[PDB]
Enzyme design. Structure first.
Site, PDB file in Angstrom:
ATOM      1  N   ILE A   1       0.926  -1.219  -0.159  1.00  0.00           N
ATOM      2  CA  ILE A   1       0.055   0.062   0.067  1.00  0.00           C
ATOM      3  C   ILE A   1       1.020   1.361  -0.069  1.00  0.00           C
ATOM      4  CG2 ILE A   1      -1.955   1.090   1.255  1.00  0.00           C
ATOM      5  CD1 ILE A   1      -2.315  -2.019   0.565  1.00  0.00           C
TER       6      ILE A   1
ATOM      7  N   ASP B   1     -25.741  25.493 -21.905  1.00  0.00           N
ATOM      8  CA  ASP B   1     -26.898  26.276 -21.953  1.00  0.00           C
ATOM      9  C   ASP B   1     -26.304  27.615 -22.890  1.00  0.00           C
ATOM     10  OD1 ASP B   1     -29.247  27.969 -20.868  1.00  0.00           O
ATOM     11  OD2 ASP B   1     -27.669  29.033 -19.772  1.00  0.00           O
TER      12      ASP B   1
ATOM     13  N   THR C   1     -28.307  30.944 -23.011  1.00  0.00           N
ATOM     14  CA  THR C   1     -28.660  32.375 -22.451  1.00  0.00           C
ATOM     15  C   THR C   1     -28.072  32.305 -21.142  1.00  0.00           C
ATOM     16  OG1 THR C   1     -30.581  32.632 -23.834  1.00  0.00           O
ATOM     17  CG2 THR C   1     -30.205  33.708 -21.658  1.00  0.00           C
TER      18      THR C   1
ATOM     19  N   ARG D   1     -35.019  39.924 -33.215  1.00  0.00           N
ATOM     20  CA  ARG D   1     -36.345  40.127 -32.727  1.00  0.00           C
ATOM     21  C   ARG D   1     -36.678  41.516 -33.265  1.00  0.00           C
ATOM     22  NH1 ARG D   1     -40.384  39.415 -29.660  1.00  0.00           N
ATOM     23  NH2 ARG D   1     -40.085  37.475 -28.483  1.00  0.00           N
TER      24      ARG D   1
ATOM     25  N   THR E   1     -30.687  24.601 -25.483  1.00  0.00           N
ATOM     26  CA  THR E   1     -31.109  25.826 -24.908  1.00  0.00           C
ATOM     27  C   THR E   1     -32.742  25.588 -24.903  1.00  0.00           C
ATOM     28  OG1 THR E   1     -31.305  27.931 -25.495  1.00  0.00           O
ATOM     29  CG2 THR E   1     -31.370  26.704 -27.524  1.00  0.00           C
TER      30      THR E   1
ATOM     31  N   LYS F   1     -32.143  18.164 -21.434  1.00  0.00           N
ATOM     32  CA  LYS F   1     -30.664  18.466 -21.125  1.00  0.00           C
ATOM     33  C   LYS F   1     -30.047  17.301 -20.516  1.00  0.00           C
ATOM     34  CE  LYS F   1     -30.804  23.394 -21.377  1.00  0.00           C
ATOM     35  NZ  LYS F   1     -30.525  24.633 -21.131  1.00  0.00           N
TER      36      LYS F   1
ATOM     37  N   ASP G   1     -26.462  27.864 -16.410  1.00  0.00           N
ATOM     38  CA  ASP G   1     -26.614  28.918 -15.179  1.00  0.00           C
ATOM     39  C   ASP G   1     -28.041  28.828 -14.466  1.00  0.00           C
ATOM     40  OD1 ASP G   1     -27.107  32.217 -16.624  1.00  0.00           O
ATOM     41  OD2 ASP G   1     -27.770  30.441 -17.194  1.00  0.00           O
TER      42      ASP G   1
ATOM     43  N   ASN H   1     -33.087  25.222 -14.751  1.00  0.00           N
ATOM     44  CA  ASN H   1     -33.301  24.253 -15.822  1.00  0.00           C
ATOM     45  C   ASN H   1     -32.041  23.684 -16.263  1.00  0.00           C
ATOM     46  OD1 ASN H   1     -32.894  26.784 -17.453  1.00  0.00           O
ATOM     47  ND2 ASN H   1     -33.411  25.799 -19.074  1.00  0.00           N
ATOM     48  N   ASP H   2     -30.883  24.129 -16.050  1.00  0.00           N
ATOM     49  CA  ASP H   2     -29.571  23.439 -16.223  1.00  0.00           C
ATOM     50  C   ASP H   2     -29.291  22.490 -15.344  1.00  0.00           C
ATOM     51  OD1 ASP H   2     -29.084  24.882 -18.715  1.00  0.00           O
ATOM     52  OD2 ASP H   2     -28.568  26.453 -17.404  1.00  0.00           O
TER      53      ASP H   2
ATOM     54  N   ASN I   1       7.089   5.845   2.848  1.00  0.00           N
ATOM     55  CA  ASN I   1       5.947   6.031   2.009  1.00  0.00           C
ATOM     56  C   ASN I   1       5.279   7.117   2.205  1.00  0.00           C
ATOM     57  OD1 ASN I   1       6.679   3.359   1.086  1.00  0.00           O
ATOM     58  ND2 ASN I   1       5.201   2.252   2.271  1.00  0.00           N
TER      59      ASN I   1
ATOM     60  N   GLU J   1      15.244   5.841  -3.502  1.00  0.00           N
ATOM     61  CA  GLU J   1      14.235   6.681  -3.484  1.00  0.00           C
ATOM     62  C   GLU J   1      14.418   8.064  -3.827  1.00  0.00           C
ATOM     63  OE1 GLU J   1      10.912   5.137  -4.362  1.00  0.00           O
ATOM     64  OE2 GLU J   1      12.230   3.411  -4.580  1.00  0.00           O
TER      65      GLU J   1
END
Ligand SMILES: Nc1ncnc2c1ncn2[C@@H]1O[C@H](COP(=O)(O)OP(=O)(O)CP(=O)(O)O)[C@@H](O)[C@H]1O
Ligand code: ALF
Ligand SMILES: [K+]
Ligand SMILES: [Mg+2]
Length: 994
Positions: free
Chosen positions: A307, A351, A353, A560, A625, A684, A703, A706-707, A796, A908
């Site tokens: 170990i 995402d 926006t 738009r 999106t 998503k 952000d 919904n993400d 070790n 070592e």
């Protein structure tokens, strides 16, 4: 209970059998509240316990080292030597180092704050119902609302349950569902059926969703579903996830503790084979307890030899080192291990926006009329720089800067913009940044009028605070806004009745200013303003106007658009009925068309190049999106996910469209597609899942609430610091500064961390399967134990533990980001790299048993016993096979052990220089690179000497090695290690596979 937005108001009132004007009876409420329970998300209780740790005791760095702590605690209860005092340190350092590593596991876990609790902040305390026992409305606990009762909501209210809308008391009900669609733009609801039973929320314009809020208006609805049977309930349902985190690094290091654990148990049987001679030769009687004392002394020595006790601490410091390096890029890492996992990522989901884009509605284009005669219409077209609500940006005609006031057209444009406008810009002095008050779309015009400055007002000298609305304020000192005709769905526009401020003249410049849906407004325009002049709206003018509007509404610039007109001769204020919006369209007729404006929530400056760089590093970005497919695509073209003339069919879907693909085609569609648009939260994470089902490492970046589902599914979720708190809570990194280019930096960081983790892991294991070699000659040849566990641990854990981490400071492989993501099915140790450190580990094992065997067999100084049958050492009392009586008990000497160990420390330290690379030799590559590796070697052996020549220690270890004695040979035994790994290094760097 109800499953429809597709039913009518009546069918819904019907379903629960309730009067719209009286609401629910206590009887019904009793029933429903019984059938459906309460209206609330349960609080992520899935599983928890102070006990937590109780389960971080699975692997080898536990069970294996847990016996060795009790098996080593019993043995250290029968230590009837003369060192009864230095006895049970092993039991207590095995368990202090075991309690140490374990308690870091938990002070890193007792940090998580739950998304589900972050999410339940979207739960209003109270709701307003109409129930039967009162004529009046009743504020009740929102959790005490049942499917079926009549619900009332208004401006500022948070929606309490998922509600079918029955009645809109206002002239328009505007909802914010950025919680679900990730857009704060106000959706205008209605009452009519939305007949598709596979409609997404974006489609369900007659529903109110629990957790959204009323931008504006008043409405009556009937609760359709409550609790976890809601759209936000679904977000909650994919938050709870008992599925424990299986990070990509961590797992390869969990079945390595699984394969080394089988080497352990199975080399404790490999001893039973060369030993166990005592059933046939040792004359049936020789201190019988000496069997369980030997088999268990070197059993719990193979445990600790194998170990790498140091490794957790080394690793958890390579990470923290990077975490704090990332911190300085304003990348705040929340889960330490994830700094790495970013480097191996092959897909990044994003995402749009507020992530890829600023989320500040921007007017980037506007035109007016330029010239008109006969069949010919030219427009003045402009462009406006600026991707932020700040009044920073400039108005360009032909890419060259102009003054907007030089244009009477723009002076009116600006005016209509300032006055037909309920929004307002505010400088938040704390955040140090301009914010909107009002609709994003209206706030866009506010900022446009500021940027435009048509009265050429002096604004330079202004405080930021005061610069916010400066130009706006000018315009509204010119025209008194008398009243305002609110937007209605019928007419798709709104306007404002305005009187002059200055004129005593007896001439009323009285005017209505209109904005709206371009088609609608242009139809109700009889004239066209040409600067200061007015001319008839011919058909060939209307065509030119309508043409560019078609163009700006659809190209690679899919804006738009909004038309602006004025009514030069408004009705008479007392002839107008302001109670009935059905009248308003008619007041808005006989307009003089002024100009048009196009709007965008524009991309962050640096997103495009980060995307380009991600590509070079062989990472693929995908946009997912909840905004519309046309917008999504046109952003994609701008940030370079699509080409400016690429035809995108088949590489972009809507949530709906995606859903119609058979399950197979969907999974393939995640391999080729890049925009997923008008999606629901669960789209998503479905997409992140399909991606991961190709065993690809995926990041999600965004952000919004919904993400969240996808921020969680993804191996790495990355939140923007301006985002929601739930998105932050759901991710492992937050880009504090919204700097999207830091994600690239974070992957380069991930890649370098891995490179170094593997180089320092080879170094550390070579001295584990190299101490086990020594414990297996310190046993297979019946020799006197050349090393004890207490020395092993210390080595070790510390002598190796330091230059291990100076091999985290290893120079970042340049060109690290010109190659692709490593495979996840990538092996760390290779069929020949195993042959390397197994070749070396083998050497040293002998070299330290061969320094216990040179303080006897050739013992130049102290108690030498040349070619002496060290098959036995109990023989001491009966000095017959070997004479030399009265010499008894030199076998327990401190010095033969000091040599083995100092040879181990010294080798070592040279291994830490062969592990200053892989194939790169110290022959060609200067050993004198890491000033840090040097610093760690000095500190390493400077501590070995504190472990020789000091008080209380050397007693837990062994007696000081003297110069001219136990050093000359500790050094002569060590040197060759370089040559052994320098020829093994040639093997790779002169005739290897490559
Ligand atoms: N306050 C306001 N004044 C003037 N025009 C407005 C306005 N609010 C919205 N508009 C205009 O509304 C027109 C339509 O808005 P509406 O929300 O009724 O739905 P819609 O017809 O745009 C379909 P969808 O939601 O699927 O895209 C838009 O093009 C926008 O320009
Ligand atoms: F900001 Al989104 F889908 F919620 F682009
Ligand atoms: K995650
Ligand atoms: Mg968003």
């Amino acid at each position: 209970m109800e499953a429809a937005h597709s039913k009518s108001t009546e069918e819904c009132l019907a379903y629960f059998g309730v009067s719209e004007t009286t609401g629910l009876t206590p009887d019904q409420v009793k029933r429903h509240l019984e059938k459906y329970g309460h209206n609330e998300l349960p609080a992520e209780e899935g599983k928890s316990l102070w006990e937590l740790v109780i389960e971080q005791f699975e692997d080898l760095l536990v069970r294996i080292l847990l016996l060795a702590a009790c098996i080593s605690f019993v043995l250290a209860w029968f230590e009837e030597g003369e060192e009864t005092i230095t006895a049970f340190v092993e039991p207590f350092v095995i368990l202090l180092i075991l309690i140490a590593n374990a308690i870091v596991g938990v002070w890193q876990e007792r940090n998580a704050e739950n998304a589900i609790e972050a999410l339940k902040e979207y739960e209003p305390e109270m709701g307003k119902v109409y129930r039967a026992d009162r004529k009046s409305v009743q504020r009740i606990k929102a959790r005490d609302i049942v499917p079926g009762d009549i619900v009332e909501v208004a401006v500022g209210d948070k929606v309490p349950a998922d509600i079918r809308i029955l009645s809109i008391k206002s002239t328009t009900l505007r909802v914010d569902q950025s919680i679900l669609t990730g857009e704060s733009v106000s959706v205008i609801k209605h009452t009519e059926p939305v007949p598709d039973p596979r409609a997404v929320n974006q489609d369900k314009k007659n529903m109110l969703f629990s957790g959204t809020n009323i931008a504006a208006g008043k409405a009556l609805g009937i609760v359709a579903t409550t609790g976890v049977s809601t759209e936000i309930g679904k977000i909650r349902d994919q938050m709870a996830a008992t599925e424990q985190d299986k990070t990509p690094l961590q797992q390869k290091l969990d079945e390595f503790g699984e394969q080394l654990s089988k080497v352990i148990s199975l080399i404790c049987v490999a001893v039973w084979l060369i030993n166990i001679g005592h059933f046939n030769d040792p004359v049936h009687g020789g201190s019988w307890i000496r069997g369980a004392i030997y088999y268990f002394k070197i059993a719990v020595a193979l445990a600790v030899a194998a170990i790498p006790e140091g490794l957790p601490a080394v690793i958890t410091t390579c990470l923290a080192l990077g975490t704090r390096r990332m911190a300085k890029k304003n990348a705040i890492v929340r889960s330490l291990p994830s700094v790495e996992t970013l480097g191996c990522t092959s897909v990044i989901c994003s995402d749009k926006t507020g992530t890829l884009t600023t989320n500040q509605m921007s007017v980037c284009k506007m035109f007016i009329i330029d010239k008109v005669d006969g069949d010919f219409c030219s427009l003045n077209e402009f462009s406006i720089t600026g991707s932020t609500y700040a009044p920073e940006g400039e108005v360009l005609k032909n890419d060259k800067p102009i003054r907007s006031g030089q244009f009477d057209g723009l002076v009116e444009l600006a005016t209509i913009c300032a006055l037909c406008n309920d929004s307002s810009l505010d400088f938040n002095e704390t955040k140090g940044v301009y914010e909107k008050v009002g609709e994003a779309t209206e706030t866009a015009l506010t900022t446009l009028v500021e940027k435009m400055n048509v009265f050429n007002t002096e604004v330079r000298n202004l405080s930021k605070v005061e610069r916010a609305n400066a130009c706006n304020s000018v315009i509204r000192q010119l025209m008194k806004k008398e009243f305002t005709l609110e937007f209605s769905r019928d007419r798709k526009s709104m306007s404002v009745y305005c009187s002059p401020a200055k004129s005593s003249r007896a001439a009323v410049g009285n005017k209505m200013f209109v904005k709206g849906a371009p088609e609608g407004v242009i139809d109700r325009c009889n004239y066209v303003r040409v600067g200061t002049t007015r001319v008839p709206m011919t058909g060939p003018v209307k065509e030119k106007i309508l043409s560019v509007i078609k163009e700006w509404g659809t190209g690679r610039d899919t804006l738009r658009c909004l038309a602006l007109a004025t009514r030069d001769t408004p009705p008479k204020r007392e002839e107008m009925v302001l109670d009935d919006s059905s009248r308003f369209m008619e007041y808005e007729t006989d307009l003089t068309f002024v100009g048009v404006v196009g709007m965008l929530d524009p991309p962050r400056k640096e997103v495009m190049g980060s995307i380009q760089l991600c590509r070079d590093a062989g990472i693929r970005v995908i946009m997912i999106t909840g905004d519309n497919k046309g917008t999504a695509i046109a952003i994609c073209r701008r940030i370079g996910i699509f080409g400016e003339n690429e035809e995108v069919a088949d590489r972009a879907y809507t949530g709906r469209e995606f859903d119609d693909l058979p399950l197979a085609e969907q999974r393939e569609a995640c391999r080729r597609a890049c925009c997923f648009a008008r999606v629901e939260p669960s789209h998503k994470s479905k997409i992140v899942e399909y991606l991961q089902s190709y065993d690809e490492i995926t990041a999600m970046t965004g952000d919004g609430v919904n993400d969240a589902p996808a921020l969680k599914k993804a191996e790495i979720g990355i939140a923007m610091g301006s985002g929601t708190a739930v998105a932050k809570t759901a991710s492992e990194m937050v880009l504090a500064d919204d700097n999207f280019s830091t994600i690239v930096a974070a992957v380069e960081e991930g890649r370098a961390i891995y490179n170094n983790m593997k180089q320092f892991i080879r170094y550390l294991i070579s001295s584990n399967v190299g101490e086990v070699v020594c414990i297996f000659l310190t046993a297979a040849l019946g020799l006197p134990e050349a090393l004890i566990p207490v020395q092993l641990l210390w080595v070790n854990l510390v002598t190796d533990g330091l230059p291990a981490t100076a091999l985290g400071f290893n120079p970042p492989d340049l060109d690290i980001m010109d190659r692709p993501p490593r495979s996840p099915k990538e092996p760390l140790i290779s069929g020949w790299l195993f042959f390397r450190y197994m070749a070396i580990g083998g050497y040293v094992g002998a070299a330290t048993v061969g320094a216990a065997a040179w303080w006897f067999m050739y013992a130049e100084d102290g108690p030498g016993v040349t070619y002496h049958q060290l098959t036995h050492f109990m023989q001491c009392t009966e000095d017959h096979p070997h004479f030399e009586g009265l010499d008894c008990e030199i076998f327990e000497a401190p010095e033969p052990m000091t040599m083995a160990l100092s040879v181990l420390v010294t080798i070592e330290m040279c291994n830490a220089l062969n592990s200053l690379s892989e194939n790169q030799s110290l022959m060609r590559m200067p050993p004198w690179v890491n000033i840090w590796l040097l610093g760690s070697i000095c500190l390493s052996m400077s501590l070995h000497f504190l472990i020789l020549y000091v008080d209380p220690l050397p007693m837990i270890f062994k007696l000081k090695a003297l110069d001219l004695t136990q050093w000359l040979m500790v050094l002569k035994i060590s040197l060759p290690v370089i040559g052994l790994d320098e020829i093994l290094k040639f093997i790779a760097r002169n005739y290897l596979e490559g």
